[PDB]
Each structure stands twice: as C-alpha cells, then as structure tokens.
Design an enzyme around this catalytic site. Sequence first.
Site, PDB file in Angstrom:
ATOM      1  N   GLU A   4       4.978 -14.634  -3.414  1.00  0.00           N
ATOM      2  CA  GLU A   4       3.683 -15.076  -3.921  1.00  0.00           C
ATOM      3  C   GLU A   4       3.839 -16.205  -4.960  1.00  0.00           C
ATOM      4  O   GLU A   4       3.107 -17.185  -4.937  1.00  0.00           O
ATOM      5  CB  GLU A   4       2.923 -13.904  -4.567  1.00  0.00           C
ATOM      6  CG  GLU A   4       2.620 -12.726  -3.631  1.00  0.00           C
ATOM      7  CD  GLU A   4       1.882 -11.595  -4.376  1.00  0.00           C
ATOM      8  OE1 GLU A   4       0.663 -11.731  -4.610  1.00  0.00           O
ATOM      9  OE2 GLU A   4       2.513 -10.571  -4.703  1.00  0.00           O
ATOM     10  N   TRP A  12       2.207  -5.331  -9.032  1.00  0.00           N
ATOM     11  CA  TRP A  12       3.386  -6.124  -9.432  1.00  0.00           C
ATOM     12  C   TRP A  12       3.709  -7.095  -8.291  1.00  0.00           C
ATOM     13  O   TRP A  12       3.336  -6.854  -7.149  1.00  0.00           O
ATOM     14  CB  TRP A  12       4.588  -5.230  -9.774  1.00  0.00           C
ATOM     15  CG  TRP A  12       5.037  -4.313  -8.691  1.00  0.00           C
ATOM     16  CD1 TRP A  12       5.745  -4.650  -7.572  1.00  0.00           C
ATOM     17  CD2 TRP A  12       4.820  -2.895  -8.619  1.00  0.00           C
ATOM     18  NE1 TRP A  12       5.988  -3.526  -6.810  1.00  0.00           N
ATOM     19  CE2 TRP A  12       5.425  -2.441  -7.426  1.00  0.00           C
ATOM     20  CE3 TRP A  12       4.191  -1.963  -9.463  1.00  0.00           C
ATOM     21  CZ2 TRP A  12       5.424  -1.090  -7.046  1.00  0.00           C
ATOM     22  CZ3 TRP A  12       4.173  -0.628  -9.090  1.00  0.00           C
ATOM     23  CH2 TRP A  12       4.803  -0.196  -7.890  1.00  0.00           C
ATOM     24  N   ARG A  67       0.775  -1.238   0.000  1.00  0.00           N
ATOM     25  CA  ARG A  67       0.000   0.000   0.000  1.00  0.00           C
ATOM     26  C   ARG A  67       0.819   1.309   0.000  1.00  0.00           C
ATOM     27  O   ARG A  67       0.254   2.356  -0.256  1.00  0.00           O
ATOM     28  CB  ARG A  67      -1.030   0.018   1.137  1.00  0.00           C
ATOM     29  CG  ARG A  67      -2.242  -0.865   0.887  1.00  0.00           C
ATOM     30  CD  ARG A  67      -3.171  -0.879   2.102  1.00  0.00           C
ATOM     31  NE  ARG A  67      -2.655  -1.750   3.171  1.00  0.00           N
ATOM     32  CZ  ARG A  67      -3.095  -1.739   4.419  1.00  0.00           C
ATOM     33  NH1 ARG A  67      -4.065  -0.890   4.756  1.00  0.00           N
ATOM     34  NH2 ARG A  67      -2.610  -2.611   5.314  1.00  0.00           N
TER      35      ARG A  67
HETATM   36  C1  HEM Z   1       1.780  -2.623  -6.707  1.00  0.00           C
HETATM   37  C2  HEM Z   1       2.322  -3.557  -5.931  1.00  0.00           C
HETATM   38  C3  HEM Z   1       1.512  -4.446  -4.968  1.00  0.00           C
HETATM   39  C4  HEM Z   1       2.060  -5.388  -4.174  1.00  0.00           C
HETATM   40  C5  HEM Z   1       3.559  -5.779  -4.056  1.00  0.00           C
HETATM   41  C6  HEM Z   1       0.993  -6.031  -3.437  1.00  0.00           C
HETATM   42  C7  HEM Z   1       1.113  -7.053  -2.534  1.00  0.00           C
HETATM   43  C8  HEM Z   1       0.048  -7.859  -2.098  1.00  0.00           C
HETATM   44  C9  HEM Z   1       0.118  -9.191  -1.501  1.00  0.00           C
HETATM   45  C10 HEM Z   1       1.435 -10.004  -1.323  1.00  0.00           C
HETATM   46  C11 HEM Z   1      -1.137  -9.593  -1.182  1.00  0.00           C
HETATM   47  C12 HEM Z   1      -1.610 -10.917  -0.549  1.00  0.00           C
HETATM   48  C13 HEM Z   1      -2.273 -11.800  -1.634  1.00  0.00           C
HETATM   49  C14 HEM Z   1      -2.264 -13.254  -1.263  1.00  0.00           C
HETATM   50  O1  HEM Z   1      -1.321 -13.671  -0.526  1.00  0.00           O
HETATM   51  O2  HEM Z   1      -3.209 -14.000  -1.688  1.00  0.00           O
HETATM   52  C15 HEM Z   1      -2.031  -8.517  -1.515  1.00  0.00           C
HETATM   53  C16 HEM Z   1      -3.390  -8.546  -1.281  1.00  0.00           C
HETATM   54  C17 HEM Z   1      -4.306  -7.578  -1.661  1.00  0.00           C
HETATM   55  N1  HEM Z   1      -4.041  -6.411  -2.365  1.00  0.00           N
HETATM   56 FE1  HEM Z   1      -2.088  -5.824  -2.958  1.00  0.00          FE
HETATM   57  N2  HEM Z   1      -0.192  -5.383  -3.750  1.00  0.00           N
HETATM   58  C18 HEM Z   1       0.067  -4.449  -4.745  1.00  0.00           C
HETATM   59  C19 HEM Z   1      -0.891  -3.657  -5.362  1.00  0.00           C
HETATM   60  C20 HEM Z   1      -2.268  -3.678  -5.118  1.00  0.00           C
HETATM   61  C21 HEM Z   1      -3.231  -2.867  -5.828  1.00  0.00           C
HETATM   62  C22 HEM Z   1      -2.889  -1.961  -7.052  1.00  0.00           C
HETATM   63  C23 HEM Z   1      -4.434  -3.113  -5.280  1.00  0.00           C
HETATM   64  C24 HEM Z   1      -5.805  -2.535  -5.666  1.00  0.00           C
HETATM   65  C25 HEM Z   1      -5.941  -1.299  -6.191  1.00  0.00           C
HETATM   66  C26 HEM Z   1      -4.277  -4.062  -4.198  1.00  0.00           C
HETATM   67  C27 HEM Z   1      -5.282  -4.534  -3.365  1.00  0.00           C
HETATM   68  C28 HEM Z   1      -5.206  -5.704  -2.630  1.00  0.00           C
HETATM   69  C29 HEM Z   1      -6.301  -6.369  -1.961  1.00  0.00           C
HETATM   70  C30 HEM Z   1      -7.779  -5.916  -1.912  1.00  0.00           C
HETATM   71  C31 HEM Z   1      -5.691  -7.594  -1.310  1.00  0.00           C
HETATM   72  C32 HEM Z   1      -6.427  -8.695  -0.494  1.00  0.00           C
HETATM   73  C33 HEM Z   1      -6.834  -9.665  -1.599  1.00  0.00           C
HETATM   74  C34 HEM Z   1      -7.410 -10.952  -1.072  1.00  0.00           C
HETATM   75  O3  HEM Z   1      -7.914 -10.976   0.093  1.00  0.00           O
HETATM   76  O4  HEM Z   1      -7.364 -11.946  -1.840  1.00  0.00           O
HETATM   77  N3  HEM Z   1      -2.943  -4.340  -4.094  1.00  0.00           N
HETATM   78  N4  HEM Z   1      -1.276  -7.451  -2.023  1.00  0.00           N
HETATM   79  C1  LIG Z   2      -2.968  -6.465  -7.246  1.00  0.00           C
HETATM   80  C2  LIG Z   2      -2.139  -7.576  -6.634  1.00  0.00           C
HETATM   81  C3  LIG Z   2      -0.755  -7.465  -6.588  1.00  0.00           C
HETATM   82  C4  LIG Z   2      -0.005  -8.492  -5.997  1.00  0.00           C
HETATM   83  N1  LIG Z   2       1.335  -8.400  -5.970  1.00  0.00           N
HETATM   84  N2  LIG Z   2      -0.608  -9.609  -5.524  1.00  0.00           N
HETATM   85  C5  LIG Z   2      -1.967  -9.746  -5.565  1.00  0.00           C
HETATM   86  C6  LIG Z   2      -2.641 -11.003  -5.027  1.00  0.00           C
HETATM   87  C7  LIG Z   2      -2.792 -12.070  -6.128  1.00  0.00           C
HETATM   88  C8  LIG Z   2      -1.426 -12.520  -6.653  1.00  0.00           C
HETATM   89  N3  LIG Z   2      -1.100 -13.681  -5.794  1.00  0.00           N
HETATM   90  C9  LIG Z   2      -2.275 -14.236  -5.125  1.00  0.00           C
HETATM   91  C10 LIG Z   2      -3.441 -13.365  -5.619  1.00  0.00           C
HETATM   92  O1  LIG Z   2      -4.378 -13.112  -4.566  1.00  0.00           O
HETATM   93  C11 LIG Z   2      -5.750 -13.133  -4.947  1.00  0.00           C
HETATM   94  C12 LIG Z   2      -6.445 -14.307  -4.259  1.00  0.00           C
HETATM   95  N4  LIG Z   2      -6.375 -14.148  -2.807  1.00  0.00           N
HETATM   96  C13 LIG Z   2      -6.931 -15.151  -1.915  1.00  0.00           C
HETATM   97  C14 LIG Z   2      -8.352 -15.521  -2.298  1.00  0.00           C
HETATM   98  C15 LIG Z   2      -9.081 -16.242  -1.180  1.00  0.00           C
HETATM   99  C16 LIG Z   2      -9.421 -17.592  -1.302  1.00  0.00           C
HETATM  100  C17 LIG Z   2     -10.112 -18.259  -0.281  1.00  0.00           C
HETATM  101  C18 LIG Z   2     -10.462 -17.548   0.865  1.00  0.00           C
HETATM  102  C19 LIG Z   2     -10.122 -16.192   0.983  1.00  0.00           C
HETATM  103  F1  LIG Z   2     -10.446 -15.485   2.084  1.00  0.00           F
HETATM  104  C20 LIG Z   2      -9.433 -15.536  -0.035  1.00  0.00           C
HETATM  105  C21 LIG Z   2      -2.741  -8.721  -6.124  1.00  0.00           C
END
Ligand code: HEM
Ligand SMILES: Cc1cc(N)nc(C[C@H]2CNC[C@H]2OCCNCCc2cccc(F)c2)c1
Lengths: 411, 407
Positions: free
Chosen positions: B283, B278, B109
């Site tokens: 991940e 990115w 963020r």
């Molecule tokens: C630009 C570099 C970014 C990095 C390095 C990053 C990193 C991450 C990582 C590592 C996760 C955890 C996902 C997982 O483990 O399943 C995550 C979750 C998330 N990110 Fe980011 N993020 C980035 C950009 C963004 C952007 C652009 C948005 C939206 C505008 C965003 C919104 C979210 C949301 C809503 C989650 C929770 C998703 C879920 O619960 O599946 N992120 N982010």
């Molecule tokens: C925008 C952005 C950037 C980034 N670096 N990384 C991401 C998360 C993506 C990529 N690498 C994993 C995927 O995350 C999206 C799916 N996340 C878990 C879905 C889920 C399943 C079951 C129960 C739950 F509560 C949630 C997004």
Amino acid sequence: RFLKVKNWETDVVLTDTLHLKSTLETGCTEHICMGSIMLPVATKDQLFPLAKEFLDQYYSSIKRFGSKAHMDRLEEVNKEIESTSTYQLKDTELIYGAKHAWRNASRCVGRIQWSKLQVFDARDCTTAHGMFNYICNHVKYATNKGNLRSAITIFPQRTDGKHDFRVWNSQLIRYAGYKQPDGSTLGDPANVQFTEICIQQGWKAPRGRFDVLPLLLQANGNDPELFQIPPELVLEVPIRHPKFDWFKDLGLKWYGLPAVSNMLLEIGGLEFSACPFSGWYMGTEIGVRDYCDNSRYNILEEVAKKMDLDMRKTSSLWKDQALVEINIAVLYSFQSDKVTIVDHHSATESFIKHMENEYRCRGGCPADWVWIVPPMSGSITPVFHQEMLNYRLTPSFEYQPDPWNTHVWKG
Amino acid sequence: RFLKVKNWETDVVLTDTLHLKSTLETGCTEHICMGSIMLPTKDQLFPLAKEFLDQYYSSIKRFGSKAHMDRLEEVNKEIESTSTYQLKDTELIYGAKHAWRNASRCVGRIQWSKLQVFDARDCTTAHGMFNYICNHVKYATNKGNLRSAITIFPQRTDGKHDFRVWNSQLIRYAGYKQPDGSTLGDPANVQFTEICIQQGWKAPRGRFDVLPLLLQANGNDPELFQIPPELVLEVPIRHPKFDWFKDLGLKWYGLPAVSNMLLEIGGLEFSACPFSGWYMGTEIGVRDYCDNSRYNILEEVAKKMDLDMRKTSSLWKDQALVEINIAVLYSFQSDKVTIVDHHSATESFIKHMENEYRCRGGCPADWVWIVPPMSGSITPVFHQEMLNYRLTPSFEYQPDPWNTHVW
Ligand code: HEM
Ligand SMILES: Cc1cc(N)nc(C[C@H]2CNC[C@H]2OCCNCCc2cccc(F)c2)c1
Ligand code: HEM
Ligand SMILES: Cc1cc(N)nc(C[C@H]2CNC[C@H]2OCCNCCc2cccc(F)c2)c1
Ligand SMILES: C[C@H](O)[C@H](O)[C@H]1CNc2nc(N)[nH]c(=O)c2N1
Ligand SMILES: C[C@H](O)[C@H](O)[C@H]1CNc2nc(N)[nH]c(=O)c2N1
Ligand SMILES: [Zn+2]
C-alpha cells in the site's frame, strides 16, 4: 443506455454504447460477480438469425448495408440453410470473421494488431496429414526467421458434431512433462497428461526438460495421428542474463512462437473447432507464468539461491527480486536473438491507446481486467488504473472441452 | 444455487452457499461485467432491522427464542413510534465485526473478530469527536504494536445533522500546487489541503506535513484540530543494503485509518465511523510511493541505482519497485511497527477463505482488489477464484461532504 469508464490516473472518461450489441451471457448477475471465475450440434431454427446478424455486420463494415449484393447474399444463405442445414462462408466473410473474433477477445491485451492477421483458409483439408502440412506452413510463415507475423489457419467447420477437426495440442509448440515415480516432474508440469497421451499413441519420448511435443491431429472425426514438427521450423531462444553470467548455466530455453490451438472459432453460427492462431510473446507470459508459477517450471527458488538472496523470510522479497531478474533475462535473450517480443510496459501502453481508439470509432471495447493486467508490477502499468467493461461479442473465440474427454475412439 | 470456486494452483474446490443470503446489487448483469468499476422510511427500516436481528440471534444460537422475539417487538415498537431505533451494545459490536467480515475488498479479514469497538454514540461536538479520535489513535498505535479499532459516532437522523470526518484517513500528508506547476507532497490531497488552508490552517508547506483533522458534528460547519505529534507514529524509510536510501527524505505513518466510509447495520446509517488496522507493505511501497499521480518516486530511485532508464524493456521500473518495497518492510520491522508483506497477507487470506467456506458457507471477495499491485501471480490469491457479492452489515462509500454540506 450509455455506460462510462474512467481512468483514475489520467481522469479520461469514455462512453460505451457497443455493449448494447452484446448477445451472450457473462456468468454474472445483479447479485453476484463471476469476474474472476476462469470458466463461468446447432439447428436450422437457431442458425439463420445468427447468419443474418453476422452478414448485416459484415455488409455494414464494407459500407454496402441494404445493397442488392447484401440482400442477394442473405437469400442465398437462407436457401443454403433450408437445403443443407448449414452454409459456407465466402473467403472475404471468413477473413472479416477471424479478425473480428480477435478484435472481440476481451482477455487479449495484444488487440491493437487485430486488423493485421494473416488468414489461412484450410477448409479444403480432409486428413491429418493435410493438417500437418497446413500447420507447418503456418509455423514457417508466422516465425519468419524471428520477425514474427500474426496468423490463423482455419480448418473445416463442424457438421453433425461427429466429424470434428481438432488439434489435440493446447499450443502448436510446447514442452513435454514427465511425472517420475518419486513424484517430481521433469519438463513442463502443465503437459504431463497430454505427454502421456502422446506416448501411448506411440511417441518415443526423449525424456528431457525441454522436449518439443509432437502434433496430435484429428481430421473429420477420425482417431488422431502423431507428427513431429521439423526442428528447423521450431525457433527457440536460450535464456541468458545481461549481467549474471551464471544464468545461462540453468539450462533454460523457450520457443519463440505462441500459437493457441485448442479454441473454437464462432462466425455467424458456424463452429470452427480447429483454428490455431499465433502472435508473439509478452515477456511476462514466459518469465512470470511459465517459469515461476508453482505448478509450472517453478525456478524461483533455484534462481534466488544463485543470487544469494535472503530466503529465510518472505519479507526480504526474495521471490519478487528473483522474479524481476528472470524477466529481464527473457526480454534480453529474445532481443539479442532478434526474435519479436514485447515487454508488459509497452504492451499495456499500446492497449490503452487501442482501447481509446476503439471507444471513439466503435462505441466500445470489451476487456477483462483480471486478464489484461500483467501478473507482475500491476499498478506500474496503465491498465491497472483503467476501468473496463466486459461483455461477449460475436464473432468470438471460445473454450471447448479437451478432445480426449469427448472423442469416440474408432480403433 | 450452489456455486463452486476453484484454486488453479492447488486444485482445492470450495462450494459457496453464502451468496444466497445477499440482498444488495453488484453493478453487473447477465449481459455485462462491471467487476473493475471502482464505484458501480418506517417501511424500509423494519425488514432491514428484522433481517439484522434474525442473523444476530442466530449467531448466538438463540434464533426464535423468547429473547429474539421480544427484541423484535421492542425494535418494531420503537420504529413505529420514533421512526428509528437504537442498537444494543452487543448488536453494535456484532454489526461492526460483521461489516469488516463482509468487506469484499479487504485482504486483512482473517483478523475480523479481533476488533476493538469504541462506542461514541454519546458524542455531540467536534471537540468531543477530536477527543474520541485521539483516544482511538493512541489505543490503535499502542507504541507500534498496532491493534485494530473502530470508533462509531451517532447514526444519521434527518440527514441534516450528519456526523462526518472530512479527512479520507485520520492521518495523511498535505499536498500543494506550485508556481512551477508541479506538486509538493501528496497530490491526492491537494484539494483537501486547500480546504484546510481556506479554513485557516497554517501549512508548513513541506513534503510530509501531517494534515489537520476537519470534524463535522451534528451537521454544523467542520472545525480544524492538530493531532498531537506524539500520537502520530512515523517511520523513516531506509534500505538494508543501500546506504543512500535514507537521503531520499522518505517516511510514512504507521497507522492506516479510513475515516470517510459509512457503516450500515440493520438499516441504520453511521456516517462517521473511522476504523484502522495495520499496513500491508505494498500500500505504501507500490501505491503511495509509485503511482504516477501520487509520490511518483520511481524515476528518482532508479537514478540512484544507476539503472538503464533508456528502454522500458530493461525493467528498471520493476527493479526499483522491489527495492523500495524491501525498504518499507525493513524500516517498519526495524522500528517494531506492525506491518505485513503481501506474501504473508495473501497466504493468511487463503487460510481465512478456507475457514469461512467451512464455517459460514462462503466468503465474498473482490479479486481485482485482493490481488496485490505487485508480483500478482507469485501470491496465492492470483490463482484463487473468488465470488463477489454484497452482504450486510457493510461499509459503503458516501459523497465527499464538501460536495453536499450547506455552509
Ligand atoms: C488489520 C490489518 C488490515 C489489513 C492488512 C488490511 C488490508 C487492506 C487493504 C490492502 C485494502 C485495500 C485498500 C486500497 O488498496 O485502497 C483494504 C481495504 C478495506 N478494508 Fe482492510 N485491512 C486491515 C484491517 C481492516 C479493518 C480493521 C477494517 C474495518 C473494521 C477494514 C475494512 C476495509 C474496507 C471496508 C476496505 C475497502 C476500502 C475501500 O474500498 O477504500 N480493514 N484492507
Ligand atoms: C483499515 C485499513 C487497513 C489497511 N491496511 N489499509 C486500509 C486502506 C487505506 C490505506 N491505504 C489506502 C487506504 O484506502 C482507503 C481509500 N480507498 C480507495 C478509495 C476510493 C477512491 C476512488 C474510488 C473508489 F472506489 C475508492 C485500511
Ligand atoms: C500479436 C501479439 C499478441 C500478444 C502480445 C497477445 C497477448 C495475449 C496475452 C498476454 C494473453 C493472455 C493469455 C494467458 O495469460 O493465458 C492473450 C490472450 C488471448 N489472445 Fe492474444 N495476443 C496476441 C495475439 C493474438 C492473436 C493473433 C489472437 C487470435 C487471432 C489472439 C487471441 C487471444 C485469445 C482468444 C486470448 C484468450 C486466451 C484464453 O482465454 O486462454 N491474440 N493474448
Ligand atoms: C496468440 C497468442 C499470443 C500471445 N502472446 N499469448 C497467447 C497465449 C498463450 C501463450 N502464453 C499463455 C497461452 O495462453 C493460452 C492458454 N490460456 C489459458 C487457458 C485456460 C486454462 C484454464 C482455464 C481457462 F479458462 C483457460 C496467445
Ligand atoms: C482465478 C483467476 O481468475 C485466474 O488465476 C486467472 C487470473 N488472471 C489471469 N490472467 C491471465 N492473463 N492469464 C491467466 O491464466 C490468468 N489466470
Ligand atoms: C480501475 C480499477 O478498478 C482500479 O484501478 C482498482 C484496481 N484494483 C485496486 N486494488 C486495490 N487494492 N486498491 C485500488 O485502489 C485498486 N484500484
Ligand atoms: Zn461481474
């Protein structure tokens, strides 16, 4: 109310009803989660109900709920409370209580063992010298020449809060820390303060990198007194690596017995402020936390130089590389010397089995994910993928303030 | 009221006041913590709009000005007449930046205010969605110099005319169940892959087959589309020390783009809002490659490394994990595709937290998710206390459309 937890790796779903029993607060609310916050004289009025709840639990566990013996015990405790403002646990209740406090410890991954706990009743103890003797016997029994056995020693309960028994050490065995004038620290930085206290109390410090600290023991609210644990009682392991011959030249060692001595044990409203307990190590506690925390021995840099890793940029993962090697070394060294240790893969696998069994037989298992998941290689252990529910059951182990902060010095 | 968070490595203490502006519930109670559970009318719409507009007008330092009150009466009137309302472009942009700002599970963020917002609220068909998505993908990829972006499709009306992207991510690899009983490619996508096939997709049946897009416009049946391969930047995975690493046959895509979430701004619901940033290296290297229910390549890699796989206590899994992650980062860097390691990303996140505590009075953060799935305690986030709470605007989960849509 039934609550479900799912394992996302195996799709196994479990149903918690046990949380319904939970009495105490978590720190969270419907609007805020404090799951990663480390830390979020009782009266007659409050005491009998706490006692009753505990004896109902105890008498259910032995399949004698509602028996004459159950009813007679309640009246006798009630009468003792009105008479003396407190009560005394039977041996059997004390054993059950101590085992259940462990069984309920949501931050402990080692709970599969909860019912094999050797309980030492030290409630007849009166002096610091008596405490030292009890503690030496505990260490000897628990160490068992490397074949470690779980144990707890229980000193007298709190009375007016002015006559507390305390072990001032945070663990029975730990290494001194010394702040130099140049701002560097010799030994373990976690123990700098405690070490200054010892020195002031008259401990003559050898001032090396691994000096075993003396015991600092308070009986019956009196000023605490110093004791050196006999060194033949302190089992230590020199750390070497199975492939890196230079690892030994770092001069690292660790002690074999993890023994927490600063927690409060609560059973049926009674407070045991000195109740040191011990098991055996999971490797990452030493190799990840003790050696690699920046605020601890902090050896990552030194180890990485010796491995000739590329240290110019974080993205070479030199820290991660050196971390795994130190942890191989810790496990290898313990196993070669036949000192009980468990690796994080095996400990976590055992915990999942323990948790499934607890859900089936008990209706739940309170667990604190933040603490259960190991500090390295999280998602390659099965606990990472396990949903958990955290809640507070009694009997319990609780934190208490460090005694140097609260103690009334008598002189 | 005032809540303190401590960092145990640095002794820095921050005070959180921002939580007091939270409205949505966490799943926890005073008697139980659910912190590790993955998924814990005209009348309803107006307080929601007023709360959003108040925070907007305050953010541009015009709280209670003429413009503020005027906009409130205008929205109020439109709600009173149409039962919904339309966001101005400025509000849509602010609402999207803030939903990311408020994403408690996102470590990335620090970047929240640099988000390119593509307004696709004029879209009417799946072909139109396909065009908007391709444009998003090309823009965000930027030949390896990745840029954050979100494309926002029309908001929900009666809930029978939803826009949905059925993919979980815009770019993911197929997964096939085999006669053997094993899985080829990505097992997390076995079901989705089958839905594509029952829709008429001709699967190459390989280990890294880029999935088609399945796009639902205005509540209609979804339609299949292949993304132009020249738009899908991929990275062959090699190791800086180990020559044999290339031969495992591994690659990954450069663009992480979550496409199944719901964006809520001012009580309005955007059910199709794909966003992308990115990668953090872990991940791919820890989760995608090493989860048992994913590519699960640990056993294979430890083999080529001639490690002692007899006993868990040799830490063979841990050694291999590290190499694999070195390889992912090395490959992306060598190809000039933006990627961040877990050390650098968590250090930025600590800096972001400090920024947010002094500028905004706090930062909602889900420790269970912010801490990387490897080497937890050697990253600074491990030692940082975090408070988790739900602020709006937000990204929320929603049901998989195939469990809901009427064919
Ligand atoms: C630009 C570099 C970014 C990095 C390095 C990053 C990193 C991450 C990582 C590592 C996760 C955890 C996902 C997982 O483990 O399943 C995550 C979750 C998330 N990110 Fe980011 N993020 C980035 C950009 C963004 C952007 C652009 C948005 C939206 C505008 C965003 C919104 C979210 C949301 C809503 C989650 C929770 C998703 C879920 O619960 O599946 N992120 N982010
Ligand atoms: C925008 C952005 C950037 C980034 N670096 N990384 C991401 C998360 C993506 C990529 N690498 C994993 C995927 O995350 C999206 C799916 N996340 C878990 C879905 C889920 C399943 C079951 C129960 C739950 F509560 C949630 C997004
Ligand atoms: C038998 C082997 C055992 C193993 C492998 C083990 C493992 C662990 C580990 C790794 C922790 C986390 C500590 C930290 O990171 O600070 C822990 C915490 C804890 N364990 Fe155990 N444990 C064992 C035995 C015991 C016993 C015998 C008791 C008490 C009878 C106990 C009660 C507790 C308590 C109360 C905590 C919380 C400590 C705190 O909050 O600071 N455990 N255990
Ligand atoms: C009985 C037993 C067995 C075992 N394997 N491991 C243990 C924990 C010991 C050893 N290795 C770490 C130490 O843990 C005891 C201290 N735990 C953290 C205390 C703490 C500090 C600051 C704020 C807090 F809220 C809490 C006990
Ligand atoms: C802030 C955070 O909760 C704190 O660093 C915790 C995280 N998890 C932990 N887990 C264990 N087992 N031991 C610890 O000391 C900690 N520290
Ligand atoms: C059960 C548990 O909540 C679950 O495995 C979580 C833990 N932490 C996570 N953290 C991230 N970043 N991504 C995840 O998918 C998960 N999974
Ligand atoms: Zn909680």
